[PDB]
Design a protein around this nucleic acid. Structure first.
Lengths: 80, 95, 98, 103, 98, 80, 103, 95
DNA sequence: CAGGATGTATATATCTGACACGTGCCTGGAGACTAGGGAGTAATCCCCTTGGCGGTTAAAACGCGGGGGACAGCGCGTACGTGCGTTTAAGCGGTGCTAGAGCTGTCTACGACCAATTGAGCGGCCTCGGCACCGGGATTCTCCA
DNA sequence: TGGAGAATCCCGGTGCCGAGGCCGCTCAATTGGTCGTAGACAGCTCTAGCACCGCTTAAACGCACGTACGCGCTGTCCCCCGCGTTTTAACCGCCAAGGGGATTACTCCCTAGTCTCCAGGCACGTGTCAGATATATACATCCTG
């Protein structure tokens, strides 16, 4: 795959800002938000793939993601 | 055949829910969230009692370590009512 | 004259809509493609469960919503109602992520 | 059983097993799974009571994750206990700042 | 007219002086008295080591300095150079302490 | 003892702000800073006293303060 | 001894004893204390070399806590490792914002 | 008489310092900070390796768990050079 | 731009206490041996992930008018910085007293461990009702004359 | 201030799939003894913490003066919002392989446990030198003319 960071669209970032309570949104917010989300997902997916390849699996399970989040102080309830 | 004997906390959380709100039920996603919550605060109280046993060169987790871990981890009047509940349960268990 | 709402009413309307909903605000397939593109730089030919990408989407949207909730406070602190990239950078470096 | 000897709904024997097999200490006392099961039952009863109240306020007889999120983010002690916790499909609290309202 | 420095130069001089030094910037006996007064509310007739109060003073001064850095960033964000209680309250709300 | 929070004087708060890089300080910063320091010290001394009276001691050692800081994510090196 | 069989300066046997008596698992492999002592010795050598360069730039021959603090905060990876860590008698990094400097 | 037998890390940190900087010494407060640093990094890597062994339902901490804990905990190229140093020491040790 | 004043970096003496090293000793680490069970590996099954396809349709993209908000300039006053003189506790050293921390020794209650048993809890399945959705009216909020 | 219009809320009606309860079974919890070490407790010693006191002096406090910065106001313009139209790709339902997760069986090697010994590391002394401080000197910078 190549360049699916533009798959995080402008109305999706606007919906996340509306849930965040934001009334007015500058036009440069979208590339900043895409970079922030890419950095967060790189850190979590890196830890989840480390947890996965320790278990000698090829499948990233939901428990690997929950543990990868748990070791960033971002505990996630609902997936075991 | 059958897969595997996944232990969880779902039936005890359901008994607790049925004794607090006798006509309110729960969803499967909410039951998974409550199971994750019980495992989380179990691992917090146990990992604080383990540290309290390690700091004092002790090798036993007792109800005094669990009570100190509850007073360290729970905020405000949670650590007052949970200590009272646990002391009451240990008192009536030893009888 | 056709009816026309003033700028800010519909924004508050969708604040009240999306702060009452529980759904996922990003489309599922673009986020899944983004996850598999990011994971291609760590190990080739990876598979994901259906709940792993859902867990990543729940955590990512909670992260971004809780960052916009702080960006909005940084915008209101500067006596604005628009959020700016300097507000995001301020929130991220006050939280301790830069 | 030990769950009914102590007057509890949570499994004292299973909590005892998880303490003995969780690599927590070299030995585990007798009253420690009783105390920990009682604390877990209290902490479950609080979040379930607040979630049932928040479910009844939305005229529903079943707890969804939204009611759990509302229960924990309104309650101050549970919000300090669960500050760094994301509840899946929980949403956020309805909260608009005062400067964003019409004048 | 005698010599007189302009407002802001000696402030920068003190910034360069105290960002180069390593001393404790609170006096020892008022901080120790404050620690014993706070500890009176939790247990009566307590007792402190000499090193425990120094560890409390090191941690407290590091906490307040790392909060004043964030407060300075919040003040600079609003295009000011004075820090205000609204900057402290914003910095603590973004860090997640209230 | 009563009212020792005024022992954290205005010049001491100004020195801590100078180390924090602050050029100009409002006059209402001092009561806000004294309240913040009192909240921090209450949470740390409460945890250190809990660690102390678990050990059946009457002296709060530096190790109890180091553990009480370590359990809040403000790990302090130098005292064991 | 096992510290010299592996080529290390850190005690493989003491790390083995702390892993056995530290309530971490029910069994401890033989290459685990060797690996952990090697990682600890590397991570000690990195912070010590940066602290010695910071001491030499201050024209001192003894490391004081100021040089350790400068070493850990002038480096992106050690600051990411030690972000939530206070070093006693360490001070801060010299940093003035550009808005506070005069015209 | 003597009081007690404190197992610090000070002589190993001093050997490492004498091998990276043969003319530089170290103060007692800096030696206490380096001892606290080594204990902290030790109990973080050991806690993460314990947690990895508990996740995969294993009973042994091996060098593979310690290597995965080092890759999870250390940032960037710290985790690239520390894995190389540990693998080199383990390869030397098993010879 | 120029010079006085102020502060800070720099070079030299000198003095002290802390650090680097030496010494005895003891306890914890290494070596050797044995037993057993955890895990590595092979083999099989079947779940569930990936890929593809086609119709729906809702969301996304794009363009456009306009208004309101961001930002820059300007002015005013007040509040905070700088400095000087007076006051007040902090800091340091010196001493004394005793509470309690820390260490040792003894004993016993308590938890680990092992074997037999059974019922508590878990997977599967089955049913029905809470809820998601749909269509229609009722209230409520906003906006422009 | 009020009427039009759009939005949201409520209120009944239908379908459906997920919660909730039952059933069979198995494996983990319970019970009963037996043992052996952890820890509770008594006792004792010695460290270090608390309290006091005198003296020096550095920092805190309070006040005066002035400046420069916060804040409010005004103007401008441009950028983001609301909305309509066209397009695109998400989504849902369906289908088909097949990769690999998950479980079982079995063997064997690696680690726990025990015992014996000895040397590495720790506490305690001890000398000496690196840094702290005092003090004079030189450069850098700030400020007002």
């Amino acid at each position: 795959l190549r360049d699916n960071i533009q798959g995080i669209t402008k109305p999706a970032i606007r919906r996340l800002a509306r849930r965040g309570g934001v009334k007015r949104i500058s036009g440069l917010i979208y590339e900043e938000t895409r970079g922030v989300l890419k950095v967060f997902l790189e850190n979590v997916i890196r830890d989840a793939v480390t947890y996965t390849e320790h278990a000698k699996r090829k499948t990233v399970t939901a428990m690997d993601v929950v543990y990868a989040l748990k070791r960033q102080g971002r505990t996630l309830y609902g997936f075991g | 055949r059958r897969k595997t004997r996944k232990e969880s906390y779902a039936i005890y959380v359901y008994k607790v829910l049925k004794q607090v709100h006798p006509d309110t039920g729960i969803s499967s996603k909410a039951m998974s969230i409550m199971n994750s919550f019980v495992n989380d605060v179990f691992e917090r109280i146990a990992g604080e009692a383990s540290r309290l046993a390690h700091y004092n060169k002790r090798s036993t987790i007792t109800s005094r370590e669990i009570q100190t871990a509850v007073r360290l981890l729970l905020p405000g009047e949670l650590a007052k009512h949970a200590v009272s509940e646990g002391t009451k349960a240990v008192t009536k268990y030893t009888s | 004259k056709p009816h026309r709402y003033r700028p800010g009413t519909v924004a508050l309307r969708e604040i009240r809509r999306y702060q009452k909903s529980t759904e996922l605000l990003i489309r599922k397939l673009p986020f899944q493609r983004l996850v598999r593109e990011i994971a291609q730089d760590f190990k080739t030919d990876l598979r994901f469960q259906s709940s792993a990408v859902m867990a990543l989407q729940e955590a990512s949207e909670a992260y971004l919503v809780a960052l916009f909730e702080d960006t909005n406070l940084c915008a209101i602190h500067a006596k604005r109602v628009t959020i700016m990239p300097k507000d995001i950078q301020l929130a991220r470096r006050i939280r301790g992520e830069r | 059983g030990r769950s009914s000897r102590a007057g509890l709904q949570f499994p004292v024997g299973r909590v005892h097993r998880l303490l003995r097999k969780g690599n927590y200490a070299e030995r585990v006392g007798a009253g420690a799974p009783v105390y920990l099961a009682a604390v877990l039952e209290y902490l479950t009863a609080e979040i379930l009571e607040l979630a049932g109240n928040a479910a009844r306020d939305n005229k529903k007889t079943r707890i969804i994750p939204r009611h759990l999120q509302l229960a924990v983010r309104n309650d101050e002690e549970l919000n300090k206990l669960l500050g760094r916790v994301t509840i899946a499909q929980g949403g956020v609290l309805p909260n608009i700042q005062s400067v964003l309202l019409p004048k």
